[PDB]
Each structure stands twice: as structure tokens, then as C-alpha cells.
Amino acid sequence: GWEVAVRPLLSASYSAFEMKELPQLVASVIESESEILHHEKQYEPFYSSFVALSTHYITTVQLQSVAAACKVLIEFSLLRLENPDEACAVSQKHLILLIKGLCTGCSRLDRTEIITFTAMMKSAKLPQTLSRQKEVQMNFLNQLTSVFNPRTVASAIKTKNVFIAQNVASLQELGGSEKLLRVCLNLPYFLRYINRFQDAVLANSFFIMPATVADATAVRNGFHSLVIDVTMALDTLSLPVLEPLNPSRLQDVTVLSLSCLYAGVSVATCMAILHVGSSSKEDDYESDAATIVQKCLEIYDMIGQAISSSRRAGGEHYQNFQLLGAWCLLNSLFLILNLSPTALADKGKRVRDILSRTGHQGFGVLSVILANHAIKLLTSLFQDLQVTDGPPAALSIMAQSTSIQRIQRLIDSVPLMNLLLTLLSTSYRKACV
Amino acid sequence: DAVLANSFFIMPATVADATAVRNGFHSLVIDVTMALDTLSLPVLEPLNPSRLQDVTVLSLSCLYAGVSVATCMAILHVGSSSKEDDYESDAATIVQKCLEIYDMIGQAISSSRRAGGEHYQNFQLLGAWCLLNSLFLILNLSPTALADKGKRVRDILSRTGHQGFGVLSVILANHAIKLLTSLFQDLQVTDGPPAALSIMAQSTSIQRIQRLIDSVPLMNLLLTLLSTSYRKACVLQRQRKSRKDPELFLGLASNILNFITSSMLNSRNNFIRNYLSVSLSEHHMATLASIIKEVDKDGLKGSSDEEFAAALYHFNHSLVTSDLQSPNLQNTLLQQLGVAPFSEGPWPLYIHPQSLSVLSRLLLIWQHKASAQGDPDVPECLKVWDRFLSTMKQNALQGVVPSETEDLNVEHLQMLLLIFHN
């Protein structure tokens, strides 16, 4: 039965996990494998919560069976992250943290959620409401059929290392890298940012629309979903799912990272506009803006590091990545520093229109952070340049160009010297004030 | 010329030509030292395509020179004071400096902001190609037959005792195995042309590995190095009771075996598994059986022996379990081991642990497959039980008291009982 199968988790929910309770849990997970992936709607939350508790208790601490069970759970979480159904007891975010935790040292789930998971455990109805020789022979057959590594990869650290190696091998076997990247690309909230980046790169111009103060407020009040999305995307990108950098995979990765940087730039512009136009809610808003911009920069840096060190993408792609990042950051800085105090802000109730048509109470910590990252990209590019008036370097990761072409494209986008002197003056004035 | 002709050239030629190439080793030493010092300066950063071509030309030619001096020293040793000691020290120094130059150039290419992963892959491919061709050439040296009758690699392949080898061979094999494991780990994550041997070429990992296979039959070469290295290590260990120590050769053997297990046996790719299934031969099983007999007869000796035993155990069981060897190959292995289920002599009542492990693994796999499919009882198990009973009955009739290492260790009895239960 299933009641006796879930009994060890019910007993252990009030304590740690007894060592003697693990092998039968593994046996039950392997035995029901044929059914776990195929279920009706009303049993689904029960099985989701059971999987959550099982994974949690496995990660808190014969290796072949554990690896098989972990592979089964990873497969379950994978197709649960692909489909996700409305009535899933565990949302997509906790599935992402669970998959990460099985590949790491179990520092994702918290008690505040497993209490609700056990409550749902009790409140859910069984499939068949919750409110020695056979196992040895199976283990013998499992050890006989396949050979565990062991040494191809003090005691606690090596057991943890082999556990992580087995788990990541199982994850890669299912091809979860492509599925995770696909699920991260077609997010319901990053979609607008990705589309905006596509239009900006196609039209050669830079777009930001916090627009007026009212539009800035409208963009606000939905910031918490953006925080959740950026956190989950960062956790997904922290997993080793990026190694086979095919050209299409490269394009997808740069699209995702650059759109995330675009989102950070946009929230920075929104906060600056709000401050120019002008409790606990405002403090929450500013803390959330700081968190999202920091996470966006972290994602950008992680993607850049992955691109630079990869054995399929080399120096040219890293240079193009740095050029795109610097272009976005510099255009953003020019836009935010061109904000009027009251004139254009009130009369408004792009960068090409601003250039065609052509008080520094904006700025802030976000502006400083963006300027620092832009200056790092710029010094890297200029150090590269140091060692025929052609076209500006194409804004694609697969393009070929020289350093002079990239610098000339940056100059064509924005007058750099005047901009730099403007930020220097404004920053010193703010510091002295 | 070698890259243009798709072939590999080394001409130490005979002993006289080897001596003629020698006696000029001091100039080569001074040249490699000055080249290494020049390459140590920061004068490599702007890697234009032409500069890349020049750098790879220089580094690969230096590696070629190290390979050539290694071949010359090996030929001199096969053919056969302070001068000889100076010559061997010079050879060691020049090969070490050549390897250092190659590694420095490779690291510079990998970390450069103008040359990326593809160029590093091509660099590794060229290095591995040169190293493997050199190893094949040196390990195919004849003792006296072709050496005296001679008074390339394509002619050798067209026309088709191991007192050569040495420390230089071990170092070259180690570097080649490092390049090979890097390339195969790259592969892991349409029968086209082999990958071009140019630093600017575009190719997939399958293409590079297939080019390496085309140049030299890899599996036979690797097994030959494993066998020769273990033989030299065991001979040196017997004589004892860098060259004077046997742990180096034992480590090389363990490393090559571990490479074979991790990169090929556990590989998921279909093409490499097909190649492994095609390229396994009965002579390889005979060599493996002789290695097993040596390791079980010698017994536990030292820590390096423990590591080599672990590697051999892992290789044996991975080969047995992962369904590449055809059944006749398994029968050949058992027959060579002397524990063939269809033999006619008395059943050996004492089985050494390694042979017992492999035999039990094979028999239990057969029994499990037969039970799962529905086949009636496998004739091999019935035959082994019958032969055990007949031998034991004969010994009972003769009233013979065996020795402590002669009949019926306990693990053998447990294994037979487990067979009986199924």
C-alpha cells in the first residue's frame, strides 16, 4: 500500500530522518515509477508533496539505488516544470530550488513550506485521505547489473561529491539543459523585455519607456513578480546546464542575459524617474529595485564568465558580449542623465528623437553601480584596442569585427567624452553636497 | 611535410644514423632553452591569424624535435661511461623543455582574447596526433630483425621483444593520454571527412576523433602500451628484490586503463561504442588474462599495486557488464583464464579472487538474462556443477589431502551455491 510507503516521511516530519527509513523509501520510489509520471488531476498534489518531502529528506544526507531514485525525482520535476498544471502542490519556483538542492548541499527549502507540505500531505486523499529478503535481492540485482564508478571522479565530503556527480550526470542524461533554457526563455514577464531588446537591436536605437510618473507607477506595483522571476532565472543559470554552446544555444544565452540586463536598466530608469518626480511601501520598492538590479548584474557576469571559459565560444564572442553590454549600459546612462527636472517630465504627459531635438536631481546608487559596470566594460574594450572608416561593428554575438570597429560603433551610438565628463561632474557634486 | 602528406616522418634510421643525429645534442639543448626563455616573455598577446599560424608552427615543431630525440634514444637503447650519461641527461632535458614549451603555448592560446575554444581544440588535436604517431612508431621498433635489415607509418601499415620503452616513453604516453581524455570528454557532451590538421579549421569532436582513428588504430596501441608498461614494472620489481623505480610505469598503466574505462566503456555516444565493439580482438583478451594471472599470482605488494588492482578490477567489470564483447570473446577470456565452463579437465577448485570475480559476474549475468527472458537453465551452469561434482568425487575416491592454496576457498563455494539457487 501507499500509506505504509508514506509512513516514514510522516514519522520523520517531527524529527530528523532515521537511517533505517531510507532504503525502503528508495524501494518505494523505484517500484511506483511506472505510475508516478502518469496521474489524474486529483491525486496530483498528493504526489507532488510526497516528491517534495522525499527529495528534501534525501538531500539532507546503496548508492546506485539512491542515484536511481534521484534520477526519477529529477525526471518528475523536469516534466512538472515543462507542463506545470494549475493544481500542482509545489509551484515552479520551488521545483527549481528543489532541482538545484539535489545538485547541491540542501540549503534551499525552509520549514515554513514543509509545514504546509505536510498539512497538504494529511489533507490529500490516497491513490489506492491521510487525515527483508526482497529488498536485499533487488539491491543485489542493481549492484550486479551496473558498476558504480567509484574512483573515476573526509568521508562526508567525498560521499557528497560522488552524490553530486551522480545527480548532475542523471540530470544531463535527461537533457534537462535544453528544457530549462526553453522554460527560462519563454517567461510570461521577461517576454516584453526580450521583445523590446529585439526591436532595439533591429532598429539600432535604444528604447526605455517608464514614460511619465503615472506610467512609472504603472510599471511599478508589479515589481515583486519581477523579483521572483529574476531569482528563479539566476538559480536556473547557476546549474551546470550551459556546456554545449552551439551557435543557436549561444544566441539564446546572449538573448536571455542581455534582456535581463535590459530589465535591470529599465527598473533603474523607473526608479530615477520616480525620484525626479517627487512610508514602508516606498522602502520596499527601493529595496526591491536594488535587489533586481543586483541580480541582473550577477546574471550578466555569470553568463559572460561562462562564455569566456567555454571550449566552443572564444575571444571574439566574449568581445561581442562585452560590446553589447557596454552599448546598453552607456545608452541607459545617457538617457537617465538627460532626464529633465520638470520641463520634459511635465510636457510629456528614445535616444534618436532626443539627439534630433538637441537640474541633475536624478542619479543615485543604481546610477553609480551601472556606471561602474559600464566603465569596467569600457576599460576592457580600450585595453583590447590599444594592442578605413568602415561600418560600425554589428551588434550580434556571431559577428566578426576589430576593436576599432567596436569603439567606433560605441562613439556613433553616443557622444562618449561629453557623457563621461557629465557623470564625473554630477557624481562629484552629489558627493560634495 | 608530415602535415602536407597526412603521414608521420621520423628518421633516426639505423644505429649509425642515430649516432649521427646524436653528438649535436648540446646545440639542440641551447636552442630549446633560448626558445623557452623567449617564449616566456609577454610577446604573444596580439594573436592575428598569421601570428597564430607562426606560433603553432613553432610549438609543434619543437614538440616534433622532442619526439625525434626520444625516438633516437629508444633506437640507441634497442641497438645496445660519462658520455652516455651526458647523452641521456641531455635527452631528458630537451624532451622536458619541449613539453614545457608546448604547454605554455597551449595555455597562451586558450586564455587569449583573440584565439578561442576552436583553436585550442585544433592545437590539442595536432599535439595528440603527433604524440600517438610517435608512440606507435617507437613501440613498433624491432629488436634485431628490422633494425639490422634496415642497414614512416604508411609503409609499416602497408607491410603489416619489447625491449624499447623507457622514461621518455612514459612521459610521452602521459601527455598523449591527457590530450586524449580532454578530446573524448569534449566529444561526450554522417561518416564525413577527417578533421583538417590546421589551427584555423572548423570541425566537430567526432571529426577529430575519427581523424585520430584513421591515422592510427587506437585501441590496439593503448593495450600494447598498457601491457608493455606493466611488464616492465613487474620485471623491475622482481629485479629490485626515475628509471630505477617501477611505480612510474605502474602509474602509467593505471592511468591508461582508467582512461579506457571512463572515456570509452562508459561513453553514451553510439559511434564510439560501435568502434569499440568492432576493434576488440581475442589477442587483447589473452593479454588481459595474462595481466590478471600476474596480478593474482604476485599478490598485494604496495600502494601503487593497490591502485593498479582497483583500476584493473574496474576495467574488467565495466567491460563485462556493458554488453560490447561478443559471447565468443567472453568464452575466449574464460578459456585463457583456465576456468572455461566447457573445459574437459578437472575443475580448478581454487580460483584467485580476480578470476573468481569476473567469472561470477559473467555467469550471474547469463543466469539473470535467461531467467528474465524465460530461457530454461543455462547449460554452462549445469556443466560447471557437473564438473565440480565429478572432480570432487574423484578427489574423495583418491583420499587426497590438498594444500592450503589448492582446493575450495570459501568464496568459490558461496558463488556455486548462489548459482544453484537460481
Residue numbers in the entry:
A (entry chain B): 28 to 88, 96 to 162, 166 to 168, 185 to 206, 230 to 354, 364 to 434, 443 to 451, 465 to 493, ...
B (entry chain A): 275 to 354, 364 to 434, 443 to 451, 465 to 493, 502 to 553, 640 to 820
Paper text:
Among the >600 human ubiquitin ligases, UBR4 plays a particularly important PQC role, being an essential and conserved E3/E4 ligase found across eukaryotes. The architecture of the E4 megacomplex is conserved across eukaryotes, but species-specific adaptations allow UBR4 to perform its precisely tuned quality-control function in diverse cellular environments.
We reconstituted the human E4 complex by co-expressing UBR4, KCMF1 and CALM1 in insect cells and purifying the ternary complex via a tag on UBR4. Focused cryo-EM classification and refinement yielded density maps that resolved all folded regions of the human UBR4 complex (HsUBR42/KCMF12/CALM12), except the flexible C-terminal extension bearing the catalytic hemi-RING E3 module. Two UBR4 molecules dimerize through two remote, structurally different interfaces to form a large ring-shaped assembly. Moreover, UBR4 disease mutations are spread throughout the ring scaffold, highlighting its crucial role for proper PQC function.
